[PDB]
């Protein structure tokens, strides 16, 4: 275990853990509330670094984290979707996939058509699944 | 958790009437109720009334409502979840049968299901509504009736005799010796006159060198003599 | 938990201070430690006393450029006789405010007993007296009139304080840069309350006889901490975690 | 007290013992909550059931108890020397006050029955200076609780200097008790021996001295 | 008893730290005449309504010679002062010999 | 009520009511959208202080809503948890402690093991539990 401590591992144990990744990426030890506590001008040129650097963190998590809202998927960090797999995407098979690429070659195989998923993902699971309450929310 | 300690041994005439005192220690005295209790020579220990620190609203029993009317203070905080405070409580006209021990104790919980009743309680204070009058005591040394010593340890004690009103306690030089020491129950003569006795379990060895001297502290009397045990001895 | 504090006045005062708040009960003293009798003391009334200073000369303005677009304000030429600055107190008003804190400093130090006022002690000339800004010129009055009497065992005259101006100035001890206030064309007349005091040492009596206690406004921050004594900045952690015979679905 | 509690209940050593309270309508507890108390005579009582079967803080699983229709109980189990007192109980709603019992004399059989370390006190040099005559004599660990007072005055009967005084438990969780002597120094110098009787079925070893 | 733990989001607990606070002030200076050394040309203005709530049953302990609210406004009003004089006419040229006069000793 | 207005009452109290703190926790009318509108330089030392205060808001807000997010808490105010209580944290009992310390108290109670009990929480409740739908999600 530890951050990132199955990069290496096969797909099927960087889903077993997982937490791991997520827990470490909004707040850091090394933030570490600013402030020196314990000359008075805080414009140095490490101020301006840290700063922009605690901005693109939340600006970072929260742009991710505003994809997984629109998905019906914010409560949890695994969630399943209605939209079918297309085979065009990939030829190989369910076992074949899960126990022979890790993830860090499979971000590379998805790559060129990974914002055409994220495009019918906004629909299927959100689009018509909260609208489908029409019929059912009350007759 | 903090012990509420009852100032008392007060007590008079019949229809004199008196206020009881009992200092709170270790607890948010604000919102914990404060009840009174009381168990007289008749058994049946009886409710007086509960009390809120705060707001003031009170409840009384019904056969003591019109009789008694007790009220309390504010408190002095010490941290962020303790305090120090104090309660009061006076009665008006009273007899024989209102004679017996009192104790205040504090409500058990800071709810709704059930806060009337007591839960941490204060050490009592022992009431005497006599028509006798006060009357110092008598000090008697205990005899050495001989006991077994072996290992070079043996009892010994002083003897009250006739006194009155209410008990008081043994106690010895500069405190030190308080473990395995014995002192018994009063006694009711005849007469109206209380007495008592105490034996000490300390190593004695040979009458001398060590310290015998016994210490009694006591009531409207006070106390100024303390006397030891008389050498003469036996074995 | 108040989000937003009272209305706080930056008053850049000297020994005494200006247009604070003060509690509804008799005098308040505060010291982070009595009896350590190097710790400066803190002095809240309850009702403040009312001070006017004036200024009577009649300065005029003399822009002098030295260079471009930069030009000099130096004092002109006079206009009337020279008269000192000064300022008015009601002697009346200031015996009884003196006399209360005496009261109070009765509890707190060697109960009945006899309580002196003496003018500053030691320093430097622009700390031991009541310094502050009017206007835009910086008036440094003598304090040694108002710290004089001294009381134990139990249409209307007004004191006034002859005060001194100083242009060049550099506060808070800062030897860093100092500033030329100009001087300010026209009348000058100040009227702020006086609300707080600043007390110092009785030296290092080793017990003894009695106690006095002299102005001396020997730093800049307790001026604040006069108006800063009742506020203070917490964390709030809105995650707790408690227990409870509860729990949620079984598969999921 | 419009209330009745089990009165006297006996119970043996690692065994357990249930006690009844109840009452009519007016203070029944079909109701009304019930709570419970530890009370050591003369000491200071101690709390021990609360809100019906919830026992306070840090009090032991060894009680228990439940209500019913028209009686609430106390359940003790395994029995331990120090449960030898008396307890009481106390009915009450949310907004009223409590409403005393009657008491409940327990006894805890089965212990081991103690010989006690019996002693004759005489009378001091300094308690003659008085013309005050007063004997006593000291009992403790003798389980169970039976007392026997009997004194010879040179083999004469007595009924007047014979002082037959309450008992009283120990803080051994034993029991202890003394009794008393009040005579005039006349009647008591003309007899100048003096004999204890202590009657303690078991071996024939009393102090006696004159 | 099968105890199992719940979690509360916003619970009223708070523990003593010191952050970066800021001003509040309504209309002031304005248009007839601005350039406060303090108030800047702009500070965040006050809400018109003030917001107390009196806590109960809290015995908060306070201490207002460690407290750093006062530490914090020492350190703004010397930057605050210092940005107030940093743009303006510097009077370097007048350090020179002064031949000086009393004035009407008569 | 009242922002914080049950911080000393009863822990019970406090649960319910609980949204008055939540609500006012990251935006305030403090802020009030910061430019004067109705000399042109905006880098005084008050900016300074603006909005790195600001920061602080939304960085110590964020912070803790990744917590709730990874316990599968995000979308409600309350959740209950699949986690046993364990003896050691506490001997007092149900009605005890709910009616007795007020969480001003609780706090300081748990603070020793409080991070340890946050361990336990990320398993039980979504390591475990998300990961369940391995054999329940289709069969
Ligand atoms: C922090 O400060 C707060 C104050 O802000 C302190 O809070 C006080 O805490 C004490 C602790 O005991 C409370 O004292 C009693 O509370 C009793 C509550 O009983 C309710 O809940 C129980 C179950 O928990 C129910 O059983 C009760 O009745 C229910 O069932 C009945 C049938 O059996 C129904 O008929 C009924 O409708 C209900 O469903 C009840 O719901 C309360 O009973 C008791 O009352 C006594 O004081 C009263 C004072 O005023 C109360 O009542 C009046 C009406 O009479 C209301 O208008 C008021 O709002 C208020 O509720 C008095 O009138 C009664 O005659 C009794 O003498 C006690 O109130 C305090 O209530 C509570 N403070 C306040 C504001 O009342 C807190 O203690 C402090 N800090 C800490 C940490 O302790
Ligand atoms: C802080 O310090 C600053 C320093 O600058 C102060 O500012 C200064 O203030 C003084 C005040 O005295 C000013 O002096 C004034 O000068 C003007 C201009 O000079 C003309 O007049 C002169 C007259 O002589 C003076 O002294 C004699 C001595 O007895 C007096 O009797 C007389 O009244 C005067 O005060 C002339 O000498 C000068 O010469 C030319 O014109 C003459 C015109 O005729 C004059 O003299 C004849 C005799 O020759 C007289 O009969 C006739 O009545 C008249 O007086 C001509 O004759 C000569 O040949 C030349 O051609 C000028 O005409 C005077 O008018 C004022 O009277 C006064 O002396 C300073 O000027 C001024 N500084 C500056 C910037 O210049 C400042 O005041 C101080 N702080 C304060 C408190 O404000
Ligand atoms: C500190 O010093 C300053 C500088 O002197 C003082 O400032 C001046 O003080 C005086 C006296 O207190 C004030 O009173 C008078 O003001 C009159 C008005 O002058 C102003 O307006 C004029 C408009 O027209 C007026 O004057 C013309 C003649 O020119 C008339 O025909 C017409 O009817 C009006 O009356 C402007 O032209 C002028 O520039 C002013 O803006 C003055 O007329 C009057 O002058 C008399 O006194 C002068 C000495 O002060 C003297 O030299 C003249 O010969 C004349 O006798 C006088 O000034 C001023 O208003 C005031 N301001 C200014 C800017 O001068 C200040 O008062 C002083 N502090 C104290 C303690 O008073
Ligand atoms: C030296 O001390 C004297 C005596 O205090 C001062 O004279 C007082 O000056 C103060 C302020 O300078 C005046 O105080 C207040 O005036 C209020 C004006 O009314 C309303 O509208 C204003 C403007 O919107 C609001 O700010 C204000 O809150 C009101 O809504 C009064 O209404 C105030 O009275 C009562 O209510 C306020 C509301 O919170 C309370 O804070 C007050 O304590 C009070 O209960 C208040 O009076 C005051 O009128 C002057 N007289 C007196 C006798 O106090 C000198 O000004 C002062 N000098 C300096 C510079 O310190
Ligand atoms: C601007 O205004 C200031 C203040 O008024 C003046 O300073 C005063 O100047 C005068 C004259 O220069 C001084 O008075 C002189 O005192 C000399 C003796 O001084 C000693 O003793 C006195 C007390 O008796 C002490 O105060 C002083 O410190 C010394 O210890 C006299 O001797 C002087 O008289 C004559 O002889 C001397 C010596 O030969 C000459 O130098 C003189 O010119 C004169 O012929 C004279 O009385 C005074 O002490 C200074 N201060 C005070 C206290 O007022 C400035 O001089 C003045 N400038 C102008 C241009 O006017
Ligand atoms: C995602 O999908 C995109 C297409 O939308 C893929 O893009 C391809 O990317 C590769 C690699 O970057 C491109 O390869 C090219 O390589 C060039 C150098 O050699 C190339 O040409 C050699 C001879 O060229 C002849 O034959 C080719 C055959 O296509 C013709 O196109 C030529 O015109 C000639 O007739 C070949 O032998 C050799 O294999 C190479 O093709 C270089 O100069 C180019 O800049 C480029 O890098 C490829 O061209 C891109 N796509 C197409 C079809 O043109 C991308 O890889 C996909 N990503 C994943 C991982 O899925
Ligand atoms: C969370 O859990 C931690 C432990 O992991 C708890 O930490 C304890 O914190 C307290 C208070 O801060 C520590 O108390 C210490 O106090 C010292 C001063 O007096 C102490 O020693 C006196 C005599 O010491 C003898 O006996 C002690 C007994 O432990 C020995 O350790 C010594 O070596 C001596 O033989 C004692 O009479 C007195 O009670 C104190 O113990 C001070 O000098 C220390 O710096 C320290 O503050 C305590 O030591 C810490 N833990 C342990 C076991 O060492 C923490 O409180 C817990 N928090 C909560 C609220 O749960
Ligand atoms: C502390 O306060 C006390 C008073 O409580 C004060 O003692 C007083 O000082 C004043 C001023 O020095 C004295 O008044 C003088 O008395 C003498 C005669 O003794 C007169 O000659 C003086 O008159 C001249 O000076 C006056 C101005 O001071 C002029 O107006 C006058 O026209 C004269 O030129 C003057 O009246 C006063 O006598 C004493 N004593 C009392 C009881 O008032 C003491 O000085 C103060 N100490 C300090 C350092 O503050
Ligand atoms: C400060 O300077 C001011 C003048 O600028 C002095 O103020 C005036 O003080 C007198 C004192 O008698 C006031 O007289 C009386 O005021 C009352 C109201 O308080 C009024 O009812 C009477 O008719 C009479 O006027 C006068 O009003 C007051 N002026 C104002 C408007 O404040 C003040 O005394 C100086 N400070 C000191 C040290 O006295
Ligand atoms: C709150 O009340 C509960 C019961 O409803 C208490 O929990 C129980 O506490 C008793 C205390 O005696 C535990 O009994 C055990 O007895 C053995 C005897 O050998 C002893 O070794 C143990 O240390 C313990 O005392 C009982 O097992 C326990 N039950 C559980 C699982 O919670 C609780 O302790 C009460 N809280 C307090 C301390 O006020
Ligand atoms: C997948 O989608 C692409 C683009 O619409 C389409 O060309 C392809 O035939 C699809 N394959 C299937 C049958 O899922
Ligand atoms: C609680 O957890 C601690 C640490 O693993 C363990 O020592 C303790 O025995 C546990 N108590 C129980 C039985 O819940």
């Known amino acids: 275990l530890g951050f990132l401590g199955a990069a290496g591992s096969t797909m099927g144990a960087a889903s077993m853990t997982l937490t791991v990744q997520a827990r470490n990426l909004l707040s850091g030890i090394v933030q570490q509330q600013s402030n020196l506590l314990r000359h008075l001008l805080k414009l140095t040129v490490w101020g301006i670094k840290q700063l922009q650097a605690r901005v693109l963190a939340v600006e970072r998590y929260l742009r991710d984290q505003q994809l997984l809202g629109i998905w019906g998927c914010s409560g949890k960090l695994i969630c399943c979707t209605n939209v079918p797999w297309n085979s065009s995407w990939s030829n190989r098979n369910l076992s074949e996939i899960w126990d022979n690429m890790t993830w860090l070659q499979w971000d590379k195989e998805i790559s060129n058509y990974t914002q055409i998923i994220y495009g019918l993902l906004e629909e299927s699971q959100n689009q018509q699944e909260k609208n489908e309450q029409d019929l059912l929310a009350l007759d | 958790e903090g012990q509420l300690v009852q100032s008392g041994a007060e007590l008079k005439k019949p229809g004199a009437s008196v206020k009881i005192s009992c200092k709170t220690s270790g607890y948010r005295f604000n919102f914990y109720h404060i009840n009174w209790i009381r168990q007289t020579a008749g058994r049946g220990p009886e409710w007086m009334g509960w009390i809120s620190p705060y707001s003031g609203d009170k409840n009384l029993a019904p056969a003591f409502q019109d009789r008694v009317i007790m009220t309390t203070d504010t408190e002095v905080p010490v941290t962020s979840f303790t305090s120090t405070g104090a309660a009061y409580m006076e009665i008006r006209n009273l007899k024989f049968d209102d004679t017996g021990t009192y104790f205040c104790?504090?409500?058990?919980?800071?709810?709704?299901?059930?806060?009337?009743?007591?839960?941490?309680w204060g050490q009592g204070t022992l009431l005497t509504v006599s028509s006798a009058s006060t009357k110092g005591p008598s000090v008697f040394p205990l005899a050495p009736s001989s006991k077994s010593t072996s290992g070079g340890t043996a009892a010994l004690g002083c003897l009250v005799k006739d006194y009155f009103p209410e008990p008081v306690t043994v106690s010895w030089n500069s405190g030190a010796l308080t473990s395995g020491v014995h002192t018994f129950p009063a006694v009711l003569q005849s007469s109206g006159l209380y007495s008592l006795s105490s034996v000490v379990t300390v190593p004695s060895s040979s009458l001398g060198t060590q310290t015998y001297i016994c210490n009694v502290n006591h009531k409207p009397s006070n106390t100024k003599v303390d006397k030891r045990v008389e050498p003469k001895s036996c074995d | 938990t108040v989000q937003c504090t009272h209305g706080i006045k930056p008053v850049v005062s000297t020994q005494l201070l200006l247009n604070g708040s003060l509690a509804e009960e008799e005098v308040m003293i505060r010291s982070e430690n009595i009896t350590n009798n190097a710790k400066n003391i803190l002095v809240q009334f309850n009702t403040p006393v009312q001070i006017n200073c004036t200024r009577p000369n009649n300065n005029t303005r003399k822009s002098i450029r030295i260079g471009p677009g930069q030009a000099f304000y130096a004092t002109g030429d006079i206009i009337g006789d020279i008269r000192q600055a000064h300022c008015n107190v009601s002697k009346a008003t200031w015996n009884e405010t003196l006399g209360k804190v005496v009261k109070q400093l009765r509890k707190h130090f060697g109960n009945n007993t006899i309580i002196r006022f003496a003018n500053s002690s030691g320093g430097d000339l622009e700390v031991t007296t009541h310094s502050f800004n009017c206007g835009g010129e910086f008036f440094y009055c003598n304090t040694s009139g108002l710290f004089n009497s001294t009381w134990i065992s139990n249409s209307n005259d007004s004191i006034t304080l002859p005060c001194r101006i100083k242009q060049i100035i550099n506060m808070w001890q800062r030897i860093g840069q100092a500033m030329y206030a100009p001087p300010i064309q026209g009348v000058i007349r100040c009227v702020s309350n006086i609300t707080g005091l600043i007390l110092t040492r009785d030296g290092g009596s080793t017990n003894s006889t009695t106690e006095t206690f002299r102005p001396g406004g020997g730093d800049m921050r307790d001026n604040w901490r006069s108006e800063l004594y009742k506020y203070k900045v917490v964390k709030i952690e809105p995650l707790g975690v408690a227990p409870t015979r509860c729990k949620r679905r079984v598969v999921g | 007290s419009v209330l009745t509690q089990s009165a006297s209940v006996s119970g043996s050593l690692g065994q357990s013992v249930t006690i009844s309270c109840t009452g009519p309508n007016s203070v029944c507890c079909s109701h009304k909550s019930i709570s419970w108390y530890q009370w050591p005579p003369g000491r200071a009582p101690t709390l021990i059931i609360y809100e019906d079967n919830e026992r306070a803080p840090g009090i032991s699983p060894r009680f228990s108890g439940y209500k019913s229709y028209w009686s609430a109980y106390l359940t003790i189990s395994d029995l331990r020397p120090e449960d030898e007192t008396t307890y009481y109980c106390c009915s009450y709603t949310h907004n009223s006050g409590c409403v005393f019992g009657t008491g409940t004399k327990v006894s805890v059989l089965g212990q081991s029955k103690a010989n006690p370390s019996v002693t004759l006190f005489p009378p001091s040099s300094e308690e003659l200076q008085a013309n005050k005559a007063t004997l006593v004599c000291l009992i403790s660990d003798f389980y169970p609780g039976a007392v026997t007072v009997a004194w010879k005055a040179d083999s004469s009967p007595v009924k007047a200097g014979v002082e037959t005084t309450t008992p009283s438990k120990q803080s051994n969780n034993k029991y202890a008790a003394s009794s008393y002597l009040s005579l005039t120094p006349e009647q008591w110098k003309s007899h100048r021996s003096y004999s204890c009787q202590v009657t303690h079925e078991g071996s024939t070893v009393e102090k006696t001295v004159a | 008893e099968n105890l199992w733990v719940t979690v509360y989001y916003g619970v009223p607990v708070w523990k003593d730290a010191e952050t970066t606070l800021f001003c509040a002030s309504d209309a002031k200076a304005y248009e007839t005449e601005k350039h406060n050394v303090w108030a800047t040309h702009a500070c965040v203005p006050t809400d018109p309504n003030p917001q107390e709530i009196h806590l109960e049953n809290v015995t908060e302990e306070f201490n207002m010679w460690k407290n750093n609210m006062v530490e914090q406004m020492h350190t703004d009003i010397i930057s605050l002062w210092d940005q107030s004089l940093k743009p303006c006419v510097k009077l370097t040229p007048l350090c020179v010999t002064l031949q000086c006069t009393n004035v009407t000793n008569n | 009520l009242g922002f914080l207005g049950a911080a000393g009452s009863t822990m019970g109290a406090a649960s319910m009511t609980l949204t008055v703190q939540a609500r006012n926790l990251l935006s305030g009318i403090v802020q009030q959208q910061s430019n004067l509108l109705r000399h042109l330089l905006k880098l005084t030392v008050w900016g300074i202080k603006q909005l790195q205060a600001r920061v602080l808001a939304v960085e110590r807000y964020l912070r803790d809503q990744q917590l709730l997010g990874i316990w599968g808490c995000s979308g409600k105010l309350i959740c209950c948890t699949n986690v046993p209580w364990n003896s050691s944290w506490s001997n007092r009992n149900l009605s005890e402690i709910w009616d007795n310390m007020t969480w001003l108290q609780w706090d300081k109670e748990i603070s020793n093991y409080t991070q340890i009990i946050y361990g336990l929480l990320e398993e039980s409740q979504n390591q475990q539990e998300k990961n369940e739908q391995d054999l329940l999600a289709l069969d």
């Open positions: 104790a504090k409500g058990l919980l800071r709810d709704g299901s059930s806060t009337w009743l007591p839960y941490l």
